[PDB]
Every structure is written in C-alpha cells, then in structure tokens.
C-alpha cells in the first residue's frame, strides 16, 4: 500500500513508485479554504511534471540522464546506497545539493537540444 | 575489434604498470578490464571505465574516453603476473581485446 515501502531500501522501494504516484491526485469561508487546498495540489503536481519535461523525462517514473554524479554530493558505494539505505535517509543525506543537481539536469538537456539542431550526425 | 598495444610488458616490483586498449569504435564509456592468472579463469578487476570491481585492491585503476582507454596497476606487487584484457560492453558483439602479458 501507500508509503508501505517507506522503511524499505532504495532498491526495494523503487519498485513501488506507481502506488505513490497515484495518491497525488485522488458557508463561504469553508468553501474558499477547500478551493485553496485543491488548487494548490494541482499546482504542485504540475510543477513536478514541468521539471521532468525540462530535464527531458516525460511519462516515466524512472529516467536516466547524462549528468555525472559528483563525489562531493555523496561519496558512497552503489551497494551501500541501494541496499543499505532508505529513501528518507538519502533525501536527508543530499538535501544540500538539491538545487545544484537540478540546475545541472537542465543544462544537460539544453545541450542535448543544441546537439539535435544538427542534421549532421555529430559522430 | 579491440587492440591492446603493450603485448609484452616486463617490470620490476614496485614499478607502476601501464596497460592500454584502443577500440575500433566508441565504447560509449562501457569498458571493463580482466585479469587472467595462468591456469585460472579470468576475473573482473574493473567493471566500468573507472569503477573498480568488488574485492579488488585500490592499486587497480583506469580511465579513458571514446576509443582510448588505459589500465593502471600501482605498485606492481609480485602477485600480479597475468594476462590483462579489455572488454567492450556497449554493443552486441562484446569483443574482448587480445590480452597482453605482464611479467614481474
């Protein structure tokens, strides 16, 4: 079920992405408060979708990119991260770099688009 | 087709060894390196261009891009007498280069 994988390792938890995704959309004073809440849920949803589109990821729960991982963001093994750590721990571990990484993801996609402006294969 | 130039390398203990491989086509950053001691099946040293395989000493490292790659063995301790091979994993015909031999 929803958040059932919260205590699972990142590897195991990556297999439940769909259930989490499905739970994002589901008296004058009271009526305004409720409209406020509904509009915001929509706006947040759309912002995440826009970022994925900007980064070149669309319609995917798992998307690969061309940005190298920096040892300065986190110096850990693949087995360490994927098998002995949860997503909550990871999120805290690298919260300092969220904006740096996002900036790089955008730059990478922009270069990709520039490369696609060539009709020459660029080999 | 992959070529490993230093077909025979002979170096005294303590001398860092350099091995190399040139692919006919880009490897797209998926090169691996193997060590085959005489009488043994090959083992994986490096599994990605710079990523070291499990249980392998830090003495083993490497690099490269496109078609040009190297393998570096720090110290060259006496145990490291083997044939060393490059392996290209980014296409279907996963060509192994012809491994070269390193003698202490």
């Amino acid at each position: 079920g929803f958040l059932g994988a919260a205590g699972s390792t990142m590897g195991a938890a990556s297999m439940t992405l769909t259930v989490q995704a499905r739970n994002l959309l589901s008296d004058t004073h009271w009526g305004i408060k409720q409209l406020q809440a509904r509009v915001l849920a929509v706006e947040h949803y759309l912002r995440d979708q826009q970022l994925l589109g900007i980064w070149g990821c669309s319609g995917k729960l798992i998307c690969c990119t061309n940005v190298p991982w920096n040892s300065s963001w986190s110096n850990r093994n693949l087995s360490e991260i994927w098998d002995n750590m949860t997503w909550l721990q990871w999120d805290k571990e690298i919260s300092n770099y969220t904006q740096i990484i996002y900036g790089l993801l955008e730059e990478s996609q922009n270069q990709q688009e520039k490369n696609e402006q060539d009709l020459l294969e660029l080999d | 087709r992959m070529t490993q130039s230093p077909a025979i390398l002979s170096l005294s203990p303590g001398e860092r060894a350099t091995l190399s491989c040139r692919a006919s086509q880009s490897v797209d950053s998926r090169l691996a390196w193997y060590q085959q001691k005489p009488g043994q099946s090959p083992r994986l040293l490096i599994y990605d261009v710079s990523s070291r395989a499990t249980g392998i000493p830090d003495r083993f490292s490497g690099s490269g891009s496109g078609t040009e790659f190297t393998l570096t063995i720090s110290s060259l301790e006496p145990e490291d007498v083997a044939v060393y091979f490059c392996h290209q994993e980014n296409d279907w015909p996963w060509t192994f280069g012809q491994g070269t031999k390193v003698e202490i």
Partner: peptide, 18 residues
C-alpha cells in the same frame, strides 16, 4: 563512473502545514 537517475513517486515526506 555513475550518473544521475531521476525517480518520480519516491516514498518520502517532509513536515508540513496544510
């Protein structure tokens, strides 16, 4: 030799007031 992979639907949360 690792690269960033982006995941969506990750089971994490932060404290919030709504």
């Amino acid at each position: 030799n690792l690269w960033v992979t982006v995941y969506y639907g990750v089971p994490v949360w932060k404290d919030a007031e709504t």
